[PDB]
Design a protein around this ligand. Sequence first.
Ligand SMILES: Cc1nc(-c2ccnc(N)n2)cn1Cc1c(Cl)cccc1Cl
Ligand SMILES: [Cl-]
Length: 446
Amino acid sequence: MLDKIVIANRGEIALRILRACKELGIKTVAVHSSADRDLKHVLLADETVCIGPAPSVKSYLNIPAIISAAEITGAVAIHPGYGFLSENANFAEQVERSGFIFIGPKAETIRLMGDKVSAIAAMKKAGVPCVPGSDGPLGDDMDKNRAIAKRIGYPVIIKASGGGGGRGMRVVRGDAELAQSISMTRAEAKAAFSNDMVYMEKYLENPRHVEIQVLADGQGNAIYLAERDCSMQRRHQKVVEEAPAPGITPELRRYIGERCAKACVDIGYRGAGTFEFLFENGEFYFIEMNTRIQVEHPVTEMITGVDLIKEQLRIAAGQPLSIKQEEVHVRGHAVECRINAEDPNTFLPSPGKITRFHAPGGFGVRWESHIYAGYTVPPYYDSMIGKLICYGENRDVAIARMKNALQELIIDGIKTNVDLQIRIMNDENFQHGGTNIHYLEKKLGL
Ligand SMILES: Cc1nc(-c2ccnc(N)n2)cn1Cc1c(Cl)cccc1Cl
Ligand SMILES: [Cl-]
């Protein structure tokens, strides 16, 4: 087991990582900005290092400062959490070059999945179903681009190969708009990644966002831990996630899961990872892979019993997977509601001091948050201040528990999205299940 690690993150995920470290007897180093001195995990950590001022560029994205903190404390590994530098291949490379373990895959693997075109090519080769597409970057030959579009069939979508999460894409519905659409996507990509590479996919009109959790030890062992539906979202931000995905049969799960696991072996994947799919008309289509642990990991933990963070730490210590595929069993159902400090009318972050706090408790209730009474939510970071996760023996039980936990939750002094979460739990279409990626924005437009 790793002697000591730097937790290269903040907020709820840093606390989540700290708890796993403590379970495993791993010493903790909490690196933090000057605005984050009173973070719960910082107060709980074995050692603390202030790595810079409030803005993320000079703290949580400050590669030399994070590496120096590992150096000064004699840490053996760095956990990047999610966001920040977790998908930064240069950071992973610098971490290993400086002589520390990066808790994540090889830098080459991060780089491979970071490039959307190369990622899809690798996944297609491995037998993972992808969206019908260009299978390569689009060039300047518009005859060739029209032929790709015809072969695929309109509508199509132009996507940037550098891009993440849905940044800068456009739907094309005929030849008439194709040339300009390619042109425009190229330009926005140049500003975002200094990379004008674009590709084409068949545009799916009303898909669900379904992602497969994997773990791989780098020793040839790779398992899939069912799936999560993340379709409930607003402006590229997930709002509610759940596991398993409604309507997914054991057979479909096994079909897609085995293909993801085999792909992990093909690419020499190491650690936790997520294969993101679009799901429409009973069919899976790979869009991208996340090579980090994700915000929504807890729903997968509830339905499988596998502690994904502890697995990351075990794998980073060079241990083989703690379980075989045949030992992974989907049981019950879990729903996560993200709790955001945000104004309900503007959807802008709403920072400030929490004056009264009470966490929900009870059977099947899991509360993931650094917040406490008297804690000030700083203006400098993301709006998500906690995650409420409810498990039950079935989806209806999980939802009923979530409704009650949400009503029990008290966060006074700041504005939150609790009332919206309650609305969603009471939504008849959500109660039925299987709503698509466009649903919440359509609902909120009414
Ligand atoms: C990365 C990505 N690809 C798509 C997409 C949608 C329809 N067809 C195709 N091919 N891709 C959508 N997104 C981003 C996204 C996702 Cl993945 C989930 C909800 C909303 C949004 Cl805008
Ligand atoms: Cl994430």
